[PDB]
A = this chain, B = another copy of it.
C-alpha cells in the first residue's frame, strides 16, 4: 500500500481474463497420419498383392504364349479395422458461475480436450492391445524390429549418423525412401545430438531447414520430431522410425463431439465427450525399433 499521499487505497491490480501455461510436451503423434473415414462397424479393403509376369516369345509361332494365363489370388487376412471407444466426462456447477465471473466454462472445455488429446496420444505411442489400442513400441516386435548394438548406453553414451545408417538398411524392403518416412526421437537423445563428424553441425543446411512439417531436424531430407515419451535405463527406446502415408492410417466414423447432461444429482450440469479411434496398418510392417535394446 503506502505510498504517502492524502488518500489511501493505492493499487489493487486487476483479474486479467487470459489462460497462461508453461511449455509442456507437444502432440506430434496425432498430427502426421492420414484419416480413413468409415460408414459402419467393420470395413475391408481389397488388397492387390504385387505380381504379374510377362512371358515373351523368342520364336515366330502364333499359338504361344498366354500372357497372363491366370492371375494372382486375394491376400484376405483380413485387414479389419477394430474401433476402440475412448471417452471422457466432467461436471460443472450452476451455483458457482454467478459467484465468480462467468469465465470458467471456456477454460473447462480446453483442459478437457487437451487431457483427451494426451490420453489418445500416449496410448498410440505405448499400449498392449487389450481394452485400448496397441502402440508402436509394442507393435515393432512381431517382426524382429529390435536392432543391435548401440555401441554404448547409460554410462558414456554417444550418438552418430552411423545409427540411422543401420536403421535405413534394416528396414529397406519393408519401408521405402525419398517420399516420405518420419523419425520420432526422445528429448534425452536430442540433448546428445551435437556433432558426429560427417556432416558437421547436426543437419545443416539439409534443404532448406525446415519448410515442410517437422519440429526441427532435416538430416538428408528425412523429417524429425520429438515426442518426449520414452523411458531411460539400459533396455528402453530412443529412435522410432514410422511410415507416413504408405501405411499406418487412423480410421474413424466420427469427429470429436461434446454432449451436456444435467441432473446428474439434484442440480448440476456435466459434459460427456466421446470419440472412437485407433491405428491400423497395410501390407506387412514398416517400422524399426530397438535401439538401445542390449546391455
> Which residue from chain B places its CB closest to the CB of A42 in the assembled complex?
B99
Report the nearest B residue to A97, measured CB to CB: B41
| Partner among B40, B98, B99, B100 whose Cβ is within 8 Å of the Cβ of A99 | B40
Q: How many copies does the complex hold?
A: 2
Q: Which residue of B lies closest to A254 (CB)?
A: B98
Q: Is A54 an interface residue (CB 8 A)?
A: no
Q: How far is the CB of A41 from chain B (nearest CB, A)?
A: 3
- Give A40-97 interface residues, CB cut-off 8 Å to B: 40-41, 83
A235: B residues at CB distance < 8 A: none
A160 / chain B contacts, CB cutoff of 8 Å: none
Residues of B within 8 A of A40 (CB): 99-101
Contacts of A99 in B (CB 8 A): 40-41, 83, 253, 276
| Contact indicator per residue, chain A 98-138, by CB within 8 Å of chain B (1) or not (0) | 11110000000000000000000000000000000000000
Cβ-defined partner of A100 (8 Å) among B41, B83, B100, B276: B41
Residues of B within 8 A of A83 (CB): 99
- Contact indicator per residue, chain A 26-50, by CB within 8 Å of chain B (1) or not (0): 0000000000000011000000000
Residue of B nearest to A101 (CB): B40
A39 nearest CB neighbor, chain B only: B99
CB distance from A275 to the nearest CB of B (A): 12
A259 CB to nearest B CB, Å? 13
Residues of B with C-beta under 8 A to A253:
98-99
> Which B residues lie within 8 Å of A101 (CB)?
40
Chain B residues with CB under 8 A of A254:
98
A41 proximity list for chain B (CB < 8 A): 99-100
**10 pairs from A and B in contact (CB 8 Å cutoff):** A40-B99, A40-B100, A40-B101, A41-B99, A41-B100, A83-B99, A98-B253, A98-B254, A99-B253, A99-B276
- Taking beta carbons and an 8 Å cutoff, which residues of A are in contact with B? 40-41, 83, 98-101, 253-254, 276
Given contacts A40-B100, A83-B99, A99-B276, 7 further A-B contacts (CB under 8 A): A40-B99, A40-B101, A41-B99, A41-B100, A98-B253, A98-B254, A99-B253
Which 4 A-B pairs rank lowest in CB-CB distance, beginning with the nearest?
A: A41-B99, A40-B99, A99-B253, A98-B253
